[PDB]
Amino acid sequence: HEYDVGKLKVEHPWLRAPADGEKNASFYAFIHNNGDTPDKLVAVKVEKFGSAVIHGDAKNLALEAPVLLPPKQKITLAPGGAYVALLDAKKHLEVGWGLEMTLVFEKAGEVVIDAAIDAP
Template identity: 30%
Template sequence: MLNKLVLLAALALPVYYVQAHDYATGSLTVTQPWSLALPLNSPTAAAYFVITNEGQAPDRLEAVDSPIAGGAQLHEHVSKDGTMKMQHVQSVEIPAGGNLVFAPMAYHVMLLDLKDRSKLVDGQSFPLILHFEKAGDLTVDVTVQKQPPESAHSAHAH
């Protein structure tokens, strides 16, 4: 009986890690990367996630890229003259001991010139490479979903 329980726990362990959607490099952890499923004719897509810095010094996300897009840019939403607008940013700092939320109406990754729209269907995933100043490169798998995760509704601060 004990052998069966140990075997069951061992088989369930990889599923737990796959569903955790956490990726780490250096003192940084990237949690739950996701994107919204869009019509196949959509010219762009966006990716969202949370970066946590458990280190003593800040780090900087300097660039992003993905094989499904001809280009990828860091963007943020800002209020100008009472209107929300999206603007390109060169890099984003992740504070020491803090986190940075990439969410709708906040910081996000814009994927431009989409090459493989088949990866933007609910249930699919695609790689996104994050280039950090100190922690180096980190590849995460972005899960495509019909609706934002519950955590995204309350994570608009940055």
């Protein structure tokens, strides 16, 4: 539920598994930058979805943009704010079994996580 990469920490990643009809999902998490230099989340790789698109700018969630990670701050990806859209689900997801995902940061590199799939 916590992942350290460089001076970053990915904390409690999760997503609401799609409803029986939907094909897309939304990925959420806390990302800490505990270092003195900025970073950004630039891409996400997920085998069980067709693609992942980062909407990192909370002022304009339509824009495809990386999540900026200012030094010594926690950034929140959450419903109604910055998030990652997971597009075109290949397989069906089930509550309890996490979703394996690779987060790519501009400077800290790649990290493999298991996102919690939550019942609601």
